[PDB]
Amino acid sequence: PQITLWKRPLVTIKIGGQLKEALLDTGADDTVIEEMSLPGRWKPKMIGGIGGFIKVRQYDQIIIEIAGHKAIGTVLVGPTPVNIIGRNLLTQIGATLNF
Amino acid sequence: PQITLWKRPLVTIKIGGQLKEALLDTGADDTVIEEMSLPGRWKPKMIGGIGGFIKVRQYDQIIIEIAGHKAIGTVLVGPTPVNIIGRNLLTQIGATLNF
Ligand SMILES: CC(C)[C@H](NC(=O)COc1ccccc1)C(=O)N[C@@H](Cc1ccccc1)[C@@H](O)[C@H](N)[C@H](O)Cc1ccccc1
């Protein structure tokens, strides 16, 4: 499937058995999900962009579904303004930016 | 042109007659460029990112070139750590997401 960028590129994802929405973000190195109860081992990390950095929980080898596609990798959990699917997982589902 | 996402999707832009690198950023509504002198009228604006808000100068109807494509539209100038090309201009260059 293919998406223009006339609207925010929101897709449904499944994480820890819960449905959420998230932005497919080519500008994001990493994947950042709002605070939630997520089983798994984690370690503290900072992640940043415009406006500075926030402290997040770094979970490795998390199974997540992104628009129907299964991916497994690192997910950062923290006080992000919006759920973000970054390049670490977009690459695993074979997403590309075309023009 | 099909950009895989193993590395940050950086391209060359031309703005105010100067070449710069910039990131193609499907998660950004707007296009934000680091501090530079640009001639003409602007208005003040605040935009938000992962770490909070920054103040920017909002310039409308700027002529810009992005990876060889012409565009004309709104450019925000302020203390972003990375020059970003948001959806307002990505739609002009015809960028789409594919997976
Ligand atoms: C998510 C982050 C892991 C990501 N940052 C990065 O991927 C790398 O961040 C840095 C920070 C400093 C220096 C060098 C690199 C990011 O901010 N990505 C942003 C672009 C960017 C900003 C600053 C530096 C590098 C990229 C955008 O893609 C951003 N995710 C969107 O605006 C999404 C969004 C929409 C609405 C509200 C809040 C967030």
Author numbering:
A (entry chain A), B (entry chain B): 1 to 99
What's the paper's own text on this?
HIV-1 protease is a homodimer, with both chains participating in forming the active site of the enzyme. It processes the polyproteins into the structural proteins and enzymes during virion maturation.
The chemical reaction of ring opening was achieved in PR/EPX crystals by diffusion of ammonia which acts as nucleophile. The new functional groups contribute to the stabilization of EPX in the catalytic site of PR by providing a direct and strong H-bond interaction (2.44 Å) between the amino function of the inhibitor and a carboxylate oxygen atom of the catalytic aspartate Asp25A. Neither of the crystal lattices were disrupted or damaged in the reaction process, and the resolution limits of diffraction data, 1.24 Å for the monoclinic form and 1.12 Å for the orthorhombic, were even improved with respect to the initial data collected with the unreacted PR/EPX crystals (1.45 Å). The P212121 space group of the orthorhombic form is a minimal non-isomorphic supergroup of the P21 space group of the monoclinic structure. Space-group and packing diagrams are particularly useful to find the possible relationship between these two structures which show very similar intermolecular positions and contacts. This analysis confirms the evidence that the two crystal forms have very similar crystal packing, therefore the analogous behavior with respect to the reaction within crystal of these two crystal forms is not surprising. The structural models obtained from the triggered reaction on the epoxide ring from both crystal forms overlap almost perfectly.
